[PDB]
Design a protein around this ligand. Structure first.
Ligand SMILES: *[C@@H]1O[C@H](CO)[C@@H](O[C@@H]2O[C@H](CO)[C@@H](O)[C@H](O)[C@H]2NC(C)=O)[C@H](O)[C@H]1NC(C)=O
Ligand SMILES: *[C@@H]1O[C@H](CO)[C@@H](O[C@@H]2O[C@H](CO)[C@@H](O)[C@H](O)[C@H]2NC(C)=O)[C@H](O)[C@H]1NC(C)=O
Ligand SMILES: CCCCCCCC/C=C/CCCCCCCC(=O)OC[C@H](O)CO
Ligand SMILES: CCCCCCCC/C=C/CCCCCCCC(=O)OC[C@H](O)CO
Ligand SMILES: CCCCCCCC/C=C\CCCCCCCC(=O)OC[C@H](O)CO
Ligand SMILES: CCCCCCCC/C=C\CCCCCCCC(=O)OC[C@H](O)CO
Ligand SMILES: CCCCCCCC/C=C\CCCCCCCC(=O)OC[C@H](O)CO
Ligand SMILES: CCCCCCCC/C=C\CCCCCCCC(=O)OC[C@H](O)CO
Ligand SMILES: CCCCCCCC/C=C\CCCCCCCC(=O)OC[C@H](O)CO
Ligand SMILES: CCCCCCCC/C=C\CCCCCCCC(=O)OC[C@H](O)CO
Ligand SMILES: CCCCCCCC/C=C\CCCCCCCC(=O)OC[C@H](O)CO
Ligand SMILES: CCCCCCCC/C=C\CCCCCCCC(=O)OC[C@H](O)CO
Ligand SMILES: *C\C=C(C)/C=C/C=C(C)/C=C/C1=C(C)CCCC1(C)C
Ligand SMILES: *C\C=C(C)/C=C/C=C(C)/C=C/C1=C(C)CCCC1(C)C
Lengths: 296, 296
């Protein structure tokens, strides 16, 4: 099927390759199989299931709230491209050092990373404002993906360096995202809302932590995983990272806004020390509206 | 110098190319000259001058303020890479459809685009908070660069579509960046500070507007410009876009903070209508502290 040169002859007992002078790019590296039929079949099923969840979340959101729909919007456009051109350039980049780079994956990431991280900075949906910390989250997260993408495109010691630069940026991201979830927990009402925030934290750190692991395991790292193998791994963490997290997000948002509809915006002053941080604790009791220095 | 296959023989009257079976990638497309010695010489001079300005801005900032230093930090690391590996993968990506993509350029852009756009959302340096508009600026700007990068990696009608998707995102970015500059102008004190804001607006829209123009003109578009040609064009708008704009930014910041040191934080309520917008006008007179509905 390929639109690089696939036909060649071996000459001088396979020491010389002869190709048609038809202007096409040529590299043996590009023609290596993407994996077993079983791996491919597994990958095509999880992709349809991802298309189904992407489709239902969008229509569901159809019945503020812009960050969840967008991630599902980008996810549906991703599947139409996968369906028609999954391994066609530039969904996959076939480069001169022999690498296959899944640009489709990294592009989606850079497009939605501000959307997801804005949403991280807006769990309750009540804020109109974003602090200095939000901005450090976006700068560090974009750096991570840019160094990572560079590492995927490189080889040898150059790949090692850019991966390590991605990790330094990534640690800063994880560290600060952890504080946000802590503040969110002590901001939202005491019941079901704190269960959902806790659920979102687990999904976030498991799914986000798995991406550098799948990088090291895939063709971009030690080549342990095949390309279909990598696809399957990515579909699982993709469903968690995007669809499910936005669904939990939308759910949380509904719950918080309904709290304002029933009890109203009753804030508090929980002074945390996880440092000397502060928080406005939404409560269901008008009585409760005081400074609660809960040093962690 | 290249580390893809550069040596080949023509056989059957140039209808067959024979190459050593040494595992190297091969494409005639990759070997096309990058331009004239004159273009190259011009490009190497502007790069050193860019290194010099990057070096002086950094040391100058050495005598809040994080966004300007970072852009100069990234710019210096860019020049050390240019010096050693300007046309080596993945500073340039040589891909299977024959394209040469200057990943070095787009990577820098994605890394600093949040930094610059945060700084756009913080001209005075007094704000601790960022509105919903800032967040739309970051989402739209990153989309622009991602669609653009995809367009550079593609060919034919696929390149046309992604470029057009980049333009749609880009228009949203320009439109909203214009409002920010209008608000900044009516926020800062009446004298020299409004000259600098006006200077920053001109630099911003000229330099940012030139990037899609250089894309259409370069190998990524209609191939009018050569690679050295493109480099020279990029060095000129690079000096404006990064060094000079951050220098004007730092200057503005100093002026505003010195206003608080002399007169103090004396805000107003200029209600704009460029819609029904509002602004806190810093003034040098304690007397002036009222609502001035200046409908534009
Ligand atoms: C043809 O190329 C092949 C490379 O496989 C050569 O075959 C092998 O030769 C080496 C000896 O240097 C042995 O170690 C291997 O056992 C051989 N067989 C295989 C399957 O690898 C062969 O010598 C070459 N012929 C000429 C004329 O150069
Ligand atoms: C060798 O290939 C060349 C291609 O350049 C052929 O030369 C040309 O042949 C065509 C005729 O079909 C003419 O229109 C051109 O004027 C010729 N010269 C050039 C410089 O292009 C040549 O015919 C081929 N020989 C064989 C045996 O196939
Ligand atoms: C913060 C998130 C938590 C989890 C994050 C996991 C950290 C991974 C680090 C491992 C160091 C090992 C070096 C990795 C360097 C990558 C380069 C590489 O794989 O190169 C391929 C090789 O040259 C050809 O086989
Ligand atoms: C908002 C900023 C203001 C200024 C912004 C300028 C707008 C550029 C649009 C031009 C439309 C023309 C179509 C451009 C499509 C690009 C694809 C391309 O160049 O393809 C190469 C071609 O196939 C091989 O020669
Ligand atoms: C876990 C992956 C999803 C379920 C397995 C589907 C699949 O690929 O199974 C085909 C079978 O192994 C025939 O070779
Ligand atoms: C987001 C990332 C998407 C990558 C874009 C994928 C677009 C696939 C285009 C397929 C292509 O290259 O088309 C070849 C042409 O159809 C035959 O001549
Ligand atoms: C330390 C590793 C480098 C991490 C990458 C850079 C950190 C993000 C940044 O630039 O934020 C600084 C800002 O001043 C925060 O208030
Ligand atoms: C923080 C202090 C400034 C140093 C920053 C990064 C060093 C890496 C620079 C990138 C060099 C890549 C060159 C290569 O990989 O060869
Ligand atoms: C404008 C470009 C900078 C000045 C020209 C430098 C340059 O390249 O000039 C070499 C000369 O043309 C010898 O062929
Ligand atoms: C930011 C973007 C930088 C691109 C990274 C450029 C890094 C250049 C590495 C050069 C390379 O590929 O090294 C080949 C090796 O030195 C010979 O075997
Ligand atoms: C319209 C073109 C598409 C522009 C790209 C998307 C706009 C950015 C966005 O998602 O922002 C919406 C947000 O709700 C703003 O308040
Ligand atoms: C807003 C409404 C939703 C449609 C969004 C974008 C359409 C383009 C999708 C990208 C398809 C690329 C496929 C290709 O280029 O082939
Ligand atoms: C599409 C949705 C999500 C949440 C995508 C996330 C991607 C990452 C968290 C990637 C992280 C990387 C790290 C931490 C370091 C190695 C390079 C990566 C870009 C793979
Ligand atoms: C390094 C500093 C700056 C300011 C880089 C800016 C880059 C752009 C403004 C690129 C814009 C593009 C547009 C508007 C549409 C075509 C694709 C581009 C990515 C080239």
């Amino acid at each position: 099927r390929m639109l690089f040169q696939t036909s060649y002859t071996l000459e001088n007992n396979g020491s010389v390759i002869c190709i048609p002078n038809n202007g096409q790019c040529f590299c043996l590296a590009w023609l290596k199989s993407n994996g077993t039929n079983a791996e491919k079949l597994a990958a095509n099923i999880l992709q349809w299931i991802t298309f189904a969840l992407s489709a239902l979340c969008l229509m569901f959101y159809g019945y503020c709230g812009w960050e969840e729909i967008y991630v599902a919007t980008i996810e549906m456009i991703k599947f139409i491209i996968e369906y028609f051109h999954e391994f066609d350039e530039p969904a996959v980049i076939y480069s001169s050092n022999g690498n296959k780079t899944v640009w489709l994956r990294y592009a989606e990431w850079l497009l939605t990373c501000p959307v997801i991280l804005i949403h991280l900075s807006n769990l309750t949906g009540l804020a109109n404002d974003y602090n200095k910390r939000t901005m450090g989250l976006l700068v560090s997260d974009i750096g991570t993906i840019v160094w990572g993408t560079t590492a995927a495109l490189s080889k040898g010691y150059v790949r090692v360096i850019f991966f390590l630069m991605g990790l330094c940026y990534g640690i800063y991201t994880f560290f600060n995202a952890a504080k946000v979830y802590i503040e969110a927990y002590h901001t939202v009402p005491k019941g079901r809302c704190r269960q959902v925030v806790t659920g979102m934290a687990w999904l976030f750190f498991v799914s986000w932590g798995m991406f550098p692991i799948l990088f090291i395991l895939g063709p971009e790292g030690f080549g342990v995983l095949s390309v279909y193998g990598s696809t399957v791994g990515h579909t699982i963490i993709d469903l968690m990272s995007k669809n499910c997290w936005g669904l939990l997000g939308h759910y949380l948002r509904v719950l918080i806004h309904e709290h304002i509809l029933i009890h109203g915006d009753i804030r508090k002053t929980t002074k945390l020390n996880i440092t000397e941080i502060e928080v406005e604790t939404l409560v269901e009791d008008e009585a409760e509206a005081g400074a609660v220095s809960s040093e962690d």
